[PDB]
Design a protein around this ligand. Structure first.
Ligand SMILES: O=C(O)CNC(=O)C(=O)O
Ligand SMILES: [Mg+2]
Ligand code: NI
Ligand SMILES: [Zn+2]
Length: 331
């Protein structure tokens, strides 16, 4: 069995290997990359996502989210307070202000220590989940706006044509902006490209050990657990690496820098934080190996998780017994 310790693998494809996205994902899996839940892909040196980032300041962040924390430094929840719209240029200035800017630090490990010690005492503002793309239309390789759609994968694998679309989303981050512990909708893959700016630190639990994380989370968030049998679908809970280590949960960590892709694999729980002003782009995708994970994915039916239009068909076709109850949560 390849990669039996479930380490995060880093890949350096040549320009020739960067032509066929599906084929390269399958190659990474042949080497055991999926066992970690997360892989890093460094694009060939010839490749670029677009020519410059000099003209992005007029993108609108219609609903910036202030991420307010409750709990203790290593075990907390966050809620998202909606703020007034602002442009990317306004947001960048805000991120760089004395109130929100990255502190002085020695290296990524020192910054990680400062994040875990101090995150809860601040409420950073995240421009998340903005439909759109920063890939140039002429970028032919690994262009996250030109991937094969999950609807077409389901149709190719299973023969059933379904409604729905699959488009990318932009994330504009600042110091301490946080992504809570989660898997993807329907336990899909994700791919994330860090277009510009400061790094993003990721934490991930191997898919084969995801239920260990879920059991800890039920212990650490006991009211939330009673409220919903899949409350990590709410994307609000944080647990630090120190706490994970104290409770014996297998995980790994890695820092993504600008110009790098990360791939999350089906049922790979992940969480993380941004080091400073940055912009990422991400989208879900599927392969034939995902289908069995989609069929088994948990679902939130309490009403909190509220998701996209396109998840309807996935539930309806892959999970017909759950469909009725899940849809009641959606309506
Ligand atoms: O970058 C972020 O804030 C969160 N992104 C992801 O969870 C992803 O790409 O799957
Ligand atoms: Mg612009
Ligand atoms: Ni994710
Ligand atoms: Zn729920």
């Amino acid at each position: 069995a390849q990669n039996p310790n479930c380490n995060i693998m880093i890949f350096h494809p040549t320009k020739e290997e960067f032509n066929d996205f599906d084929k390269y994902i399958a190659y990474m899996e042949s080497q055991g990359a999926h066992r970690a839940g997360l892989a890093k892909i460094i694009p060939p040196k010839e490749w670029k996502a677009r020519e410059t980032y000099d003209n992005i300041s007029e993108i609108l962040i219609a609903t910036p989210l202030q991420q307010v924390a409750s709990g203790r430094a290593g075990v907390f929840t966050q809620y998202h307070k909606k703020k007034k719209a602002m442009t990317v240029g306004e947001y960048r200035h805000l991120a760089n202000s004395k109130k929100y800017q990255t502190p002085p630090h020695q290296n990524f490990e020192d910054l990680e220590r400062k994040y875990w010690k101090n995150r809860i005492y601040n409420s950073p503002i995240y421009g998340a989940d903005i439909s759109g793309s920063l890939f140039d239309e002429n970028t032919k390789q690994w262009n996250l706006g030109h991937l094969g759609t999950i609807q077409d994968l389901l149709e190719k694998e299973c023969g059933v044509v379904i409604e729905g679309v699959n488009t990318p989303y932009l994330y504009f981050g600042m110091w301490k902006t946080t992504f809570a512990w989660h898997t993807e909708d329907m336990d899909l893959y994700s791919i994330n490209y860090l277009h510009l700016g400061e790094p993003k630190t990721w934490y991930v639990v191997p898919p084969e050990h995801g239920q260990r994380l879920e059991r800890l989370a039920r212990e650490l968030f006991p009211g939330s657990s009673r409220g919903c049998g899949a409350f990590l679908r709410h994307k609000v809970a944080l647990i630090s690496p120190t706490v994970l280590k104290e409770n014996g949960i297998p995980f790994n960590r890695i820092t993504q820098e600008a110009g790098e892709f990360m791939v999350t694999f089906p049922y790979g729980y992940h969480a993380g934080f941004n080091h400073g002003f940055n912009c990422a782009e991400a989208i879900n995708f599927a392969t034939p190996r995902w289908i069995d994970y989609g069929k088994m994915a948990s679902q939130c039916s309490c009403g909190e998780a509220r998701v996209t239009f396109s998840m309807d068909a996935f539930v309806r076709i892959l999970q017909p017994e759950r469909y009725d109850l899940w849809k009641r949560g959606q309506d």
